[PDB]
Amino acid sequence: GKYNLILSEYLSFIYNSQSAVQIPIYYSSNSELENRCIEFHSKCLENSKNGLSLKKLFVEYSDVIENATLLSILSYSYDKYNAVERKLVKYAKGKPLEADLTVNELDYENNKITSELFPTAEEYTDLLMDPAILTSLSSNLNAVMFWLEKHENDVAEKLKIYKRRLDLFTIVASTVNKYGVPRHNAKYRYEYEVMKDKPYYLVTWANSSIEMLMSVFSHEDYLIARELIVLSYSNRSTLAKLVSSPMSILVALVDINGTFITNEELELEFSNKYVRAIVPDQTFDELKQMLDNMRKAGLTDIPKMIQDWLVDCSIEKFPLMAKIYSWSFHVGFRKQKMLDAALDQLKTEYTEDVDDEMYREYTMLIRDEVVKMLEEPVKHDDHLLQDSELAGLLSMSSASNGESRQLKFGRKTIFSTKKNMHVMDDMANGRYTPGIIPPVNVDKPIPLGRRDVPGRRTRIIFILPYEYFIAQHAVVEKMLIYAKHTREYAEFYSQSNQLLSYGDVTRFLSNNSMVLYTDVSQWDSSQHNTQPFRKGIIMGLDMLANMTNDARVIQTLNLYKQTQINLMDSYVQIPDGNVIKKIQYGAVASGEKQTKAANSIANLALIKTVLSRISNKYSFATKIIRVDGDDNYAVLQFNTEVTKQMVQDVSNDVRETYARMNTKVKALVSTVGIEIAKRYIAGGKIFFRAGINLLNNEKKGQSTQWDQAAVLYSNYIVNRLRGFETDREFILTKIMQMTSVAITGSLRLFPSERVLTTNSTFKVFDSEDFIIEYGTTDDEVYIQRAFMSLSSQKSGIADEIAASSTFKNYVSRLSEQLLFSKNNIVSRGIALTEKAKLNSYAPISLEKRRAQISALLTMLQKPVTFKSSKITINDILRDIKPFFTVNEAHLPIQYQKFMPTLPDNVQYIIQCIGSRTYQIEDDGSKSAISRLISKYSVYKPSIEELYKVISLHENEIQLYLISLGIPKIDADTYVGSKIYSQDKYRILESYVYNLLSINYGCYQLFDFNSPDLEKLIRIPFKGKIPAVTFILHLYAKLEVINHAIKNGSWISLFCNYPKSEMIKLWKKMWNITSLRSPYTNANFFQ
Amino acid sequence: LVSTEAQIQKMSQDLQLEALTIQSETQFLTGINSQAANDCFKTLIAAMLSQRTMSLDFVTTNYMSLISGMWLLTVVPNDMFIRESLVACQLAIINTIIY
Amino acid sequence: SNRLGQLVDLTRLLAYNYETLMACITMNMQHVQTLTTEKLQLTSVTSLC
Amino acid sequence: MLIGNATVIPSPQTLFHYYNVNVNFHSNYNERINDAVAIITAANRLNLYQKKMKSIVEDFLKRLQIFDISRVPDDQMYRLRDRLRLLPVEIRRLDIFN
Amino acid sequence: RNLPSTARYIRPNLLQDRLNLHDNFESLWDTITTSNYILARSVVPDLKE
C-alpha cells in the first residue's frame, strides 16, 4: 500500500503545473458503498471535464479515500513530451567524455558520428546499437531524476550511497547535455534523423551506464562505476569478456574448508571435507599478462582490487571478486554484424598432420553410443518410429522460426516464420513432400540466426526446411529417452523434470585428486565436427538398419542417413549490405533439433578420445566426466598425492594432445574450482553468474510493453539472488512508467499497486520480494473474476485461417493418414485441437492480447462489475482464515551457509530451514496420462486446459483425447482404467504451484517436506479429502514463512477446520477459474 | 601395429565395463593407443640395459592392466622391480585372481 | 590367452633386440636398487600387449 | 532407508592425513608439557617466591592453537601447575639442567 | 624410491597423557572432543551412491 504514494509524487514532480491535474478512480465490493463510490466517481469525472479544482471534495468523501480500493490515475497536462531538459540543467556541471577510436579492433565499432559511417539514411541501420527494448531513454532519465529528488534528505549510510550515485549521474549528465537527447518513435527505436549529428554508440552506453550506476550500494561499487563508465564509452568488443576471464583461474586458489554435495539433483548433504590448492607457477604469469592487458586498457583500481586480495587468498573477503564477476555482464552486448560475428568463428586452420588412429576411434565411440541409444526402440518397433512423419507434424510447434515466406489465407498475405504454417502452405500446392529431402548447396544455401549472450562469443543458428525436423525428431527423442538416465549428459539427465543445478564435482575433491575443466564454445567450426562425426552416425545407422526387420523404419533411417549426407555439405546465405555471400560450411552448429544433444555426444566422444593419453604417464581412476554444451569437466583421483610439477606437465601434455588433433584450448586444471557460463564454485561454496542486461536485450522478441516489464523484474529478482543487486525502487518506477499509457497528447494513464502484484494474467511484481501476495478481501476476487471473464478472447485471423482451404486440406490429410469414417464427430475435435497449437503463432497472441488490453481498458476507465459468483483462490483463503491460531515461537540455528551472495535475511531463512530436495511435476510429466503424451508426442498441454479437462463428463474427455493424435483403443482403455481420477490431485498440485510460482523463483528453492517447517504447522490429519489438507498445510507454511521474512520471528499454528466447511468446499474445488501469466515467472536457472 | 579400434570393440562389447560399476558411476576402457606401446618398449629396454629399477603406478579396478602385468612379471624377472611395487602388484593379483 | 602367438612374438623380438644391443656395452652391468625410479604405467603395457 | 550396494572406504591419503595430524598434535603436546615442567622445577629450585605461575601456563595454552585463554580461569591453570609439579623432565632438558 | 643408509628421520614423542586430562579438565576435554569431532567430520566418506 505504498507504491501508489510514490506514483503520486512522481506525477506531481514530472508535470508540476497548475494545469497538471491528477484524477484517481476507486472501487468497492459493497453495493451501497459502491453506489457512493460511483457518485464520487461521477462528480470527479465531471469536475475533471470542467477544469474545476478536485482537491476540495477529497476531504468530504474521506471514507472512499481510506477504505475503497484504487485502480489507476489519469493525468491531463499540456506539454510537448520534453521536460527532461527543463529539470536537468542543474545536474550537469561535471566534465563531458571524449572517445578513443584506437580501442576497438574495427573502425566502425568506435563511437564516432553516424554520418561518418552511414551518410545516407537509406543504408542506415540502428541494429548495431539498437537497445531492442520498449522503453525510452526519457523514461529512464525521468526515473533517475525523481529518485534523486526524493532521496535528497535521508541521512545515513543510504545518503553516502546517494552522494556517490549523485556524483556519477553528474558525470553522466555533463556528457549527455553536451549533445542532447535522442527522441523515440512509436516503437521506441531511434532513427537516423535524431542521431544524424551525434555519435553512433552513445545510446547503448548511456542505457548501460544508467543500469550500472543504479546498482551502486558500496564504495567499491563507486570505484567500479567510475572505472567502467569512462572506458565503456570506447571499448565495446573486448571488455566484459576480458575482465570476466581471470575468474576461471581464481576459483583454483581457495582452499576448501566445508563443502556441499549432490546425490539426485537437489539432494544436499554438507561435508566438512578440507582440500588444499596446488597452483602452478606459470598460471600466475598468465594472470600477470592478463593484468598487463587490463592496465593497458586504462584500469587502475581493479588490478589493485585483484592484487590486495592475494595476500591472504581468503574466502571471506572473496565475494567482492564474485560481485565484480557479475559487474562484467551488466555493461551490454557487442552488437556487431552477422558477418563479423561469424568471422570470430569462421577462421580455420585445417591440417593434414593429425592422426588417423584418433579419428577412427572417435567415430567408433560415436557409433557405439548411437547403438546404445537406439538398440531398444529400433528393435521393438515402436509406433512413434513408424509414424515419425505424423509425430513431427504434431511437434512442429516446438521447432525453430523458419525463414520468412509469403503465404495467403484466402484473401490476405502473411510472412510467418512458423514452420507448421509453412507446411500448411506447402500442402495446398502439392509441395508437402517429406520423402524427398531438399539439398543444401549452392542452389539453396541456408539463412542464419545469431545466439548472443554478453561477455562471450556469438553462436550461430541454422534456419532449415521442414523435412529436416521431421527426419531428426523421432531418433533424437529416443536418444533423449536414453539420455534421461545417463548421468554424463548433464543438459539431459533428469528425474524426468530437472536439470542438475549444483554440479557433481564435490564428492571426490581432495588433496589427492584433481579436475580438468575446459571451455569448448569455439569448437563449432572445428575440424572434428566435419566428416568423421557424420560418417560415424551413418555407420551407426547401418548397424541399426541391420538390427531391424520393419520397412517403414528402414525408410525413416535411410532418409535420416541422407539428411546427414546433406548436412555434410551445407552452404549458408549471409548478406553484406546489398549483395549476398554463400560459403562452404560442411560441419555442425546449433539451430537444429539434433544439435544440442549431438554436440554433447560429440564433446563426450572428443574428450573420451583425448583422455586415453594421460594414461600413458599417470594412473588415475576416472570418477566423473561431464559435458553441458559450451564446456566440460572431468575429475580424477590418483594412487598418490598431487604436486605442482605433475599439474604443469599434465597441462602441457593435455594442450599438446589437443594440438595433435589440431584443436585450440585454454586448458585449465585445478583441485577445488571451476568456472563455466552458468555457475562456478570456490572453496566449497556455490556462486552464480548474474549476467542479464536489463536496458539492452539479446534480440527483438514479440512481447508488449507490458510483459517485458515483468520479464525484466523476473531477471532483476534472479540477478539479485545471484548477487548483483540493483535498487528495487528504480525498477518499480520503470514498471509504472512502462504500464503508463498515453491516450492523447495530454492524457496519460497510470495503473496502481493492487493491479500489478495481484494474482492474474497481468501480475508483474510483488509488494514484498520473494513473496506472492494474496487477497483476504472481496475486492481481489472481484477484479480477478472480472479479468478471468476478459482473458478468454478470440483472434479473427485465427478464425479465418481455420476457415480457409489449407486448414481443410491439413485436416483431410491428418484424417486419411490416421482414420476415416467419423468425419463429423472427431475431425471437428481435431480441428479444435490444432487450434490449441496455432496459438503459439505470435500475431494471433498479439491480436488476442491487444484485444484483452482494450477490453481491460474499457473497465479501468469506468466502474466495476459483480462478475457472477466465479470462485477463485482468494475466496478460499477468505473462508479458511477464521479457523487459525497463532503462537510465538523461537527456532534455533542448525543449517550451514553455502550461498554467501544472498541477502542475510534470505540466508537466515536458509540458516534455519533446509533447501529443496524434490521438484514436483509442474507440468505433470510423471503422470501416467503424460507418460502417454510423452509416448505419442512431446507436447505440454497447459495446466489451464488440463485442470478443466479432468472436471468434465466421461464423454467429451474421449473426444478431446482422441483429437490429440492418440488412437481410440488406448483412450478407451485409459478411460476404463480410471487413472485420471488418480491424477486430479497431481494436476491440482501443479495448477496451484503454477498459479503461485512455487516452482518459479524464490519458492522454487525451498523444502516443503521439511521437519523444521512441519513442527510449527500443527494441523492434525483427518483423511479422505486430500485437496483440503494439502492446501491448508501449504497456506499455513506460507503464512509462517511470510511472517518470518517480514519480521524474523517464528510462530506455530493450529486449524481445527470443521467438517461442515470441508464438505462445503469439496464441491467448490473443481470449478476454479484462475490463471497466471507465463511471462511473470523468474527461473533462477536459465 | 594393429589398429586400436578392433581391440576397443571386442573389450568394449564383451566386458560391458559401462555396466560393471554402479550404472550411476563412471567406468570405461583405458588407453590401448599407439605412442605408448613403443613408449613402453623404449622404457623397458632402456631400463633393463641400464639396469634402472622402475616402479609401477596403476589402478586395481582396471584388471586388464593387471592381466597384462602378470604376463609382464612372468616374462620379465622380479629383481628388476623394486620389491614394494612388485609385492603390491602380486598381492592385488593374488587377492583378486588366484585365491 | 588368445594373444598367444602375438605375445610370443613380442617377447622374442624384445629379447632378441635386448641381447643384440647388450653386446654393444663395455662396462660391467651390475644390479642395484637405485635411489629414484622410473615410473611405468601398466596401461602402456596393455597397449603393447 | 536410502542405502544399498555402495561401499565407501576412506582413501589412504585421508588416512595418512588424519594419522599425521594426530601424530603432530600428540608430539607438540608432550614437548610443551616437558618444557613447562622443566621451567617449573627450575623455578622451585631457585626459590622464586614472587613468581605467579600463570603466564607460563598462558604460554603453554597459547602454543596449543585451539583454546580461548580469555575464558579459562586461574584456578584450572594452577591445578595444571599442581599436576605438572609431579612429572619427570625429559632427558635433553633434564640432563642439560643438571 | 629406495633410500640410502646415509639418510635419517625423526621419531615423534607419543607418550600418553601424563596429566589425566579426562579427570577434571572438562572444559579442555570438551574442547578436545569437539576439536576431534569436527576434525573427524572432514574425513568421513560421502555416501557416493
mmCIF file of N, CA, C and O in Angstrom, chain E residues 3 11 21 25 30-31 33 35-36 42:
data_model
loop_
_atom_site.group_PDB
_atom_site.id
_atom_site.type_symbol
_atom_site.label_atom_id
_atom_site.label_comp_id
_atom_site.label_asym_id
_atom_site.label_seq_id
_atom_site.Cartn_x
_atom_site.Cartn_y
_atom_site.Cartn_z
ATOM 1 N N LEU E 3 65.857 -45.537 -0.369
ATOM 2 C CA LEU E 3 66.560 -44.561 0.466
ATOM 3 C C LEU E 3 67.911 -45.086 0.950
ATOM 4 O O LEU E 3 67.979 -46.242 1.390
ATOM 5 N N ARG E 11 61.710 -39.433 15.092
ATOM 6 C CA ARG E 11 60.603 -40.151 15.671
ATOM 7 C C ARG E 11 59.801 -39.198 16.562
ATOM 8 O O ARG E 11 60.392 -38.430 17.326
ATOM 9 N N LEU E 21 43.903 -35.668 31.795
ATOM 10 C CA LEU E 21 43.021 -34.566 31.446
ATOM 11 C C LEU E 21 41.566 -34.977 31.304
ATOM 12 O O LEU E 21 40.694 -34.104 31.260
ATOM 13 N N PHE E 25 39.376 -31.789 33.863
ATOM 14 C CA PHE E 25 39.717 -30.692 32.975
ATOM 15 C C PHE E 25 38.693 -30.684 31.861
ATOM 16 O O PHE E 25 38.993 -30.688 30.665
ATOM 17 N N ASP E 30 36.251 -31.047 26.677
ATOM 18 C CA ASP E 30 35.182 -30.617 25.787
ATOM 19 C C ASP E 30 35.756 -30.035 24.515
ATOM 20 O O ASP E 30 35.302 -30.348 23.412
ATOM 21 N N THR E 31 36.777 -29.186 24.664
ATOM 22 C CA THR E 31 37.425 -28.570 23.513
ATOM 23 C C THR E 31 38.095 -29.625 22.655
ATOM 24 O O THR E 31 38.009 -29.595 21.428
ATOM 25 N N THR E 33 37.432 -32.903 22.557
ATOM 26 C CA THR E 33 36.450 -33.778 21.947
ATOM 27 C C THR E 33 35.726 -33.082 20.814
ATOM 28 O O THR E 33 35.458 -33.684 19.774
ATOM 29 N N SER E 35 37.028 -30.569 19.022
ATOM 30 C CA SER E 35 38.073 -30.472 18.018
ATOM 31 C C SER E 35 38.221 -31.763 17.239
ATOM 32 O O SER E 35 38.306 -31.765 16.007
ATOM 33 N N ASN E 36 38.224 -32.877 17.948
ATOM 34 C CA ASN E 36 38.404 -34.155 17.295
ATOM 35 C C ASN E 36 37.177 -34.529 16.504
ATOM 36 O O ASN E 36 37.284 -35.109 15.420
ATOM 37 N N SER E 42 35.605 -34.119 8.610
ATOM 38 C CA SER E 42 36.188 -33.829 7.305
ATOM 39 C C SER E 42 36.762 -35.055 6.599
ATOM 40 O O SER E 42 37.313 -34.900 5.504
#
